[PDB]
Amino acid sequence: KQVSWKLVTEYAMETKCDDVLLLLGMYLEFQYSFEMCLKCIKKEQPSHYKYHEKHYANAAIFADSKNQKTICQQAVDTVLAKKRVDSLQLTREQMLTNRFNDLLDRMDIMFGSTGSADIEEWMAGVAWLHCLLPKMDSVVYDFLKCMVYNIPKKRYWLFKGPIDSGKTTLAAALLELCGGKALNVNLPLDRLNFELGVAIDQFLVVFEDVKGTGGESRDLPSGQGINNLDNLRDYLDGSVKVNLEKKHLNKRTQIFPPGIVTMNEYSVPKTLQARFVKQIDFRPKDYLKHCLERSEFLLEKRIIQSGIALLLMLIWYRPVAEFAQSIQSRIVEWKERLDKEFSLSVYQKMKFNVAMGIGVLD
Amino acid sequence: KQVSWKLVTEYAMETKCDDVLLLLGMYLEFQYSFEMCLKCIKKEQPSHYKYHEKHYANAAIFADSKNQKTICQQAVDTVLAKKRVDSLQLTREQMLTNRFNDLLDRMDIMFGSTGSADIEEWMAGVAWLHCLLPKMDSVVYDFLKCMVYNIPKKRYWLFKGPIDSGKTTLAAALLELCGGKALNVNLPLDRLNFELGVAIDQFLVVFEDVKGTGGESRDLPSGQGINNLDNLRDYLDGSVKVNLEKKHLNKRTQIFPPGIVTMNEYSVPKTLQARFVKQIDFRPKDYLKHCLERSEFLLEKRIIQSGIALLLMLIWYRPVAEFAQSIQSRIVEWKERLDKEFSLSVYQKMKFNVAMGIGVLD
Amino acid sequence: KQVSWKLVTEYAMETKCDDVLLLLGMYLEFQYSFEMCLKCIKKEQPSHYKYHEKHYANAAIFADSKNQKTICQQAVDTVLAKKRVDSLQLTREQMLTNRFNDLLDRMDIMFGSTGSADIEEWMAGVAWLHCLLPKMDSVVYDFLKCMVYNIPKKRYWLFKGPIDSGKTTLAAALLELCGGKALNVNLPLDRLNFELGVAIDQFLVVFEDVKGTGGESRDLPSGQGINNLDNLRDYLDGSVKVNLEKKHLNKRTQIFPPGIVTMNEYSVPKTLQARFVKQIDFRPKDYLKHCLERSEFLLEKRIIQSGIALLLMLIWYRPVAEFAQSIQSRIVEWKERLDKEFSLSVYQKMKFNVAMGIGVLD
Amino acid sequence: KQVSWKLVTEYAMETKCDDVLLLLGMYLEFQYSFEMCLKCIKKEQPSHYKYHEKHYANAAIFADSKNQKTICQQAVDTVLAKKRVDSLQLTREQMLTNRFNDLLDRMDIMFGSTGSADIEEWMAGVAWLHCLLPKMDSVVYDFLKCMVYNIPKKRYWLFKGPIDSGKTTLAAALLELCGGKALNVNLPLDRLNFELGVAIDQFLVVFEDVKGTGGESRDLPSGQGINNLDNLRDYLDGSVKVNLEKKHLNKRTQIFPPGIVTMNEYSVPKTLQARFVKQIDFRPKDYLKHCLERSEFLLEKRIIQSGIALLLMLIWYRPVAEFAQSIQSRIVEWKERLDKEFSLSVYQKMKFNVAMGIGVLD
Amino acid sequence: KQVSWKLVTEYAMETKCDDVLLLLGMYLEFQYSFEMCLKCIKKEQPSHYKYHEKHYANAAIFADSKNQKTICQQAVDTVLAKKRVDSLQLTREQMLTNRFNDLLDRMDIMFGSTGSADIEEWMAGVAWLHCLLPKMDSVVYDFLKCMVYNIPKKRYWLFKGPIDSGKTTLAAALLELCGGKALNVNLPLDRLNFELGVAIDQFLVVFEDVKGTGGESRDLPSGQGINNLDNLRDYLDGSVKVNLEKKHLNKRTQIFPPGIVTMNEYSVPKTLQARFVKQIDFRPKDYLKHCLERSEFLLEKRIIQSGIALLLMLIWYRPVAEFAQSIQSRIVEWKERLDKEFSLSVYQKMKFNVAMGIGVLD
DNA sequence: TTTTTTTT
Ligand SMILES: Nc1ncnc2c1ncn2[C@@H]1O[C@H](COP(=O)(O)OP(=O)(O)OP(=O)(O)O)[C@@H](O)[C@H]1O
Ligand SMILES: Nc1ncnc2c1ncn2[C@@H]1O[C@H](COP(=O)(O)OP(=O)(O)OP(=O)(O)O)[C@@H](O)[C@H]1O
Ligand SMILES: Nc1ncnc2c1ncn2[C@@H]1O[C@H](COP(=O)(O)OP(=O)(O)OP(=O)(O)O)[C@@H](O)[C@H]1O
Ligand SMILES: Nc1ncnc2c1ncn2[C@@H]1O[C@H](COP(=O)(O)OP(=O)(O)OP(=O)(O)O)[C@@H](O)[C@H]1O
Numbered sequence A, B, C, D, E: 001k002q003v004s005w006k007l008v009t010e011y012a013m014e015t016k017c018d019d020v021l022l023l024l025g026m027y028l029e030f031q032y033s034f035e036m037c038l039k040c041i042k043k044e045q046p047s048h049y050k051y052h053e054k055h056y057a058n059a060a061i062f063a064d065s066k067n068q069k070t071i072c073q074q075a076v077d078t079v080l081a082k083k084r085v086d087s088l089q090l091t092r093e094q095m096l097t098n099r100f101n102d103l104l105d106r107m108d109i110m111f112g113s114t115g116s117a118d119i120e121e122w123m124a125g126v127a128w129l130h131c132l133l134p135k136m137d138s139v140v141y142d143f144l145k146c147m148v149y150n151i152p153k154k155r156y157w158l159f160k161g162p163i164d165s166g167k168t169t170l171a172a173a174l175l176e177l178c179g180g181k182a183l184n185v186n187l188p189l190d191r192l193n194f195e196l197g198v199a200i201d202q203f204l205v206v207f208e209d210v211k212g213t214g215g216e217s218r219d220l221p222s223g224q225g226i227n228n229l230d231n232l233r234d235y236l237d238g239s240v241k242v243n244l245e246k247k248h249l250n251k252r253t254q255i256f257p258p259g260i261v262t263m264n265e266y267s268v269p270k271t272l273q274a275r276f277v278k279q280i281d282f283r284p285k286d287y288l289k290h291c292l293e294r295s296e297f298l299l300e301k302r303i304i305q306s307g308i309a310l311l312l313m314l315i316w317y318r319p320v321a322e323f324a325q326s327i328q329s330r331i332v333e334w335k336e337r338l339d340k341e342f343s344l345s346v347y348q349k350m351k352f353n354v355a356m357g358i359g360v361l362d
Numbered sequence F: 001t002t003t004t005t006t007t008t
């Protein structure tokens, strides 16, 4: 009798497992009997307890195999291959619906009976976020449509403002919402070539806190970032396929994703200024600070950074009509759940608290 | 029974597939029964639904194999081999004749019954491009000849002028038409060797927005691009075969392809100026912007960036006899279909709208 | 008859052997009869004498294999895979609990009947460490809580004071207790990239001797480190993931670990001062100096460096309920053993000796 | 019939051979008739003539093998694994006995009847070394003990004196005795970090001819050695582990070995002076110079630089109990040989001769 | 039947082929019928005609093997292993013996029945060489002996003399006789250091003309040479091992090989002067150059810098006893030939023609 | 082994 490589590939597929070592370690856990498996019985990880009993017999035979790493290598390549197929064949809209399905699936667990997310704490986060900029939910919707359309040379948004104005905070949540990567371009030009490699097949990117020069007039430290970006002008325009590489990999050629740039108030060359479709100014506000001091469970649990928070904001504010047709059904059920939990006065009480700079809860 | 490596190889030829992961991913989809395959029934992409039913039998047994990446590698090698044989033995006119047939096949689908595109929106785009320069269709025909003849040291066209003059736009559609690559040479020299490795067996190349020096007087940020290019005179001249890199691969020796350079107008040292047979100077023209602004679907469907649009322009403007003889049969049908669909009065009406800067339609 | 790869993997798991050559060498030693084995009889190394009798039969066949290094590689992969699974799934409390179990095992040997270590000398160490700072045991307990909760911004501690004031001693003991790595950020700004690479998957980090500037007024050597630090606030605040690089490896994205900063008396920018929950002032007290002169076995055996010494300090001082609930049983057993061998008056006599600056033992 | 890989592995172990080509070459020699073998009959090389008979049958069958390098590679791995195990498990005192046994084996050859060397010429070297410092043999014994104990802080010895005063000579001999490496820290502070990587797993290090500053007033060339060194106190004290680089390869952590520092009479900061256990300083002496000038076979045979000479000196002067138990039997036999070979009056003549600065032999 | 790998390995040993491709090519030539092999019949190349008939049948089967390069790789390892063995066991005297034995083999066929050269051309070579300075045969024999012993400090000779004074010409020829390299030191300190690893395993080394600092006091253009050498002391003296490095590579330890310095007439500090056994001085010479101008077959066939010309010069001047004791037979055999083919009068006529500066032949 | 890193 022999290992079924097919069953391992199925496990890799259904867990979306990218890493060969993680896959290996996970699969080997199944060799003990599920019947007593404490990880199953304590329901500790779904990517274990859902699968252990199914995969058990093949795991025992796999445990004896002499090829174990080769089998995992084949499985992981299949997961990688499916991503590459999807990168070419899906519409950008349909990609976003898949991503939303996955966040909505994680939310199903978080706010379940199992798991521990207090939906009231998370809704308090939405209140604080909705304060950070005027018409916040409209701003998020405009960004999402811009990311779907990916209109050439209208692909990038610039966040400006003083330090501690929440710009990277807001960038973090958007990145989780869409999926994508942060990049640091203040590097030297040689390392920069490998830095850009991580963009491959990603949907969205964020350039974190690029440095200009001469901002030492406001005591901004100087650095290369702005000048490096103005060399990469082509990559922002997104009109033509560009060549990207990773350590020991031959290049791949694709259109470089859309995204966000964040900075303090250095001056921007006109060449680069013309690449941004929109700029947003962030400013420090005392009531947010005073509220947040009295509300630190927000930060302790990282609610304010997380794409889950933005998704809850959208579900609150936007019509069902604005979602794609497949997910509209789940959207209606979540809208139903939220309204049952929170009346508007309860939500307004929160927003009123934040504006008053008391702790969000009274 | 056992996997036919032959049938896998045949599919790779049919699809003209280079990436082993893209090949692997798509071939695996055929493992499920085509009898109900939703991708077939929704007729989503032809590279699937044409082939699924034929390959299903072999795709099933492939899904069980332990060699999968090895089989895909050999198939990918066969596709790459075909490209290298063609690269040596065909006339440049034959290569382009084959290239046109591929685009025309895509146009059969785009305006077919599946008909996802609208021929009117696409023809509106043609009017917009022909308005971009004097005698546009003549300039296109000149460029094709120059690339086909490939006269040594008379091989390169320089596009120049300010931001948003459109030079990238025009370059993009040409690159699609002829099937080249873009390259970025503003990086430092020690990275550059592997970048140029991309140009192996390519028909055409474009170097994008190569940064110069001294134009800082006009606030053009300085860079290395011009210095890098002037180190590479030989590659422009195409006078003698030169060596090209790939990671983990030994050098390939061949003549470096012809093509196009874009700049916002830094100064060009005369060693480098001597190597351009022609230069075209682009100008911002506000009424185009106003037309675009009221014609959003052009950019959103990326119409004006497509060689498909340029092919439609040539079919509208040029004599049948000017095309390579084998295609002329297809040209006649496309000319007929165009005349059937568009009255010249409609095309005149459109071009008037473009000139007026109203939205193209009325 | 065949080799059992399973038994090798089991030995590698049990020994947690990370290195293929270390694994290979030790396994081959078992091929001689354990019944006569000199290393067994001298009870020299636990990873041998516990295991020789069990694996002897398989080691005899392993000695004839032609595959030997291939067997070992698969085994080492299994141990590495287990670490990555743990890294992604354990709670930080679980991690720390495991680490303590390791130290408790090493203590059972050191103070075992075979053990070389005189528990009295190690208690003298704890008396000296407890004199280093007021409320020393409470201070340690606070630090551990802070590491396990890993609350954003509330993450970093500052050790400050003159040369030869013990800060590196305490840092090393804490780093041993928790596991982690030292980092040097006085480097020029480019090399920092690979330097930060070592933090990958670590529980804890320490920044040595960050050199300020302008402390040359106080004859302090000036250097870059302080400026390098405030340029990394996103790493310290731990609120958002960062990208980390190792030589020859693709980046991984994670929350940067919590840690400790150590310095002599440079001035600190207020922006940087805000990052730290606690600053601890170390000052030289020459009665400790005169004590070490007359208690040198502390230094010679490195007792005052050891996490083992801090663990004994916790066991002696803290209530049982404070320990991770599972291992509380082992803690009680160690408390009982300590109570048996050291009456409070014995320990307090030692502490009084240290206070007098005289030799600890009398 | 089959090659025994086991017999090759034995030969590699018995010869301590760890270059795959060196092993491969020598094993192939055994294919020819042992009975006839000229090398055996010349008794020329022990690693041959001790072995050729034993291995002859297996070497013949190995000569037909289609697989030869794989066998040698596995054998080499066995020898490297043995070193790896030993490096982590042995006591420092056992390492020294191992190192001593090796030298004693080579002396059995050199002064055996087959040996080319003259024990009287080597004994002349011992006398010249003994005159280089008062109580030379006690100095050497103290130094060795210090390295074996490796007591923290009490780890480093300083050699001072004019050029051509022998400090390099003695350091080289000690380093040949114990094993270790030299280092140069006159470098700038960037290159330094790769330079220290040399020390990994070494038993000793030596710092060669560090340059101070302002020694130019004594014509001593200035340099950064001392300033670099005074910043490394944590490496010297040996009280905690440190991180060590290598080019390309990844970082490593260990205690920095004990060692020796050598210089001309620059000043030293008191901060650095406190690092040293023992300042030894060298005068040039004319009679040593004149004696060398009349006994140049010493230099020509490189006797006075050799660790063999130091071992001979220890045997001549030290009590047997000062040697570790295992070697004491060989020590007794060598003492007895030496007593038989030199009556004390011979040695007294040699010493008194050197005191007259005439050539050692008369 | 099947390929004998053994026969291939014998041929590689007998022909001392280092290169896998060269081996493969030549062995394939044997596949055609030896019984009428036209290359054999033309007696073109001993490496073929001496072996074809013997290897014929095996070469036929070799041509049908599917595995050919694998056979050749193992055979090439056998030859490289033989070098690695000898490189670590022979005396320098034996090494030179082999080196001469090789050149005498070349000499045997060079003027064999193929008549492929005329000795008189080389006698004119020898004649011109002996004119270069006094007693040139003795200078060779002495320098040769000097390098064979490699006695410490007594290791370096200095070649003074202007541009185009022949010092380079001489050393290049003498390196053919011995084997070794030339090196440069007129270097910035990085490059100075990274040259040094080239010396690894060199039997002998040379310095290319050292452009000593401030030679422009003599109008000699200069760089770092002098003080670099004066500070690189011990490398000259060869007293103790030194560790040597080249770019990216690791260091390795040996005694630094002996050698010679070429210099134009720069300044020397007596410190650096003291490092040398001999000063020699050079010039272009006017009869000699007018002879070269008239004797150009010497330069055309490279005779005047062949080591073969030095070998012949020794065989002419030096008695048989001065040569390696087994090789002395061949010395007699070649003395016979030259003493037969040339009277001393024809040698005197040639030498007299050099003395007149007239074309050596008359 | 190349590559990446070292080297620059
Ligand atoms: N608009 C704001 N007004 C006041 N406090 C703010 C504001 N935004 C953020 N904060 C506080 O400042 C902290 C840092 O926020 P954040 O990191 O997003 O700032 P940033 O200016 O965007 O930073 P950086 O430029 O370094 O990425 C937050 O955790 C919160 O405590
Ligand atoms: N001639 C033009 N007049 C007005 N608008 C133009 C013109 N050409 C292009 N545009 C607008 O400018 C946008 C960018 O065009 P494009 O990138 O081709 O210009 P470019 O001159 O090559 O710029 P750059 O050098 O900055 O990349 C187009 O998408 C279109 O909206
Ligand atoms: N409080 C103290 N009073 C006096 N001596 C002390 C005190 N603490 C430490 N020592 C002495 O200082 C020596 C060095 O300690 P340690 O390495 O921790 O100092 P440090 O100030 O943290 O040094 P560095 O900043 O150089 O790493 C100890 O071995 C001990 O001899
Ligand atoms: N005590 C001495 N008196 C006189 N000459 C000496 C003495 N010791 C060594 N020599 C001579 O000095 C030569 C060099 O010795 P060595 O390299 O050990 O000296 P050093 O003091 O370490 O020199 P440097 O500082 O130049 O490296 C020896 O080979 C010997 O010829």
Ligand SMILES: Nc1ncnc2c1ncn2[C@@H]1O[C@H](COP(=O)(O)OP(=O)(O)OP(=O)(O)O)[C@@H](O)[C@H]1O
Binding pocket: E132, E161, E162, E163, E164, E165, E166, E167, E168, E169, E170, E209, E262, E263, E264, E282, E283, E284, E285, E286, E288, E289, E290, E292
């Ligand atoms: N004594 C000589 N008589 C005639 N020609 C000579 C003599 N010396 C050198 N030349 C000519 O000059 C050429 C260059 O010689 P070589 O390079 O050996 O000289 P060099 O002194 O080392 O030169 P440089 O110092 O300029 O590098 C010789 O090959 C020869 O053609």
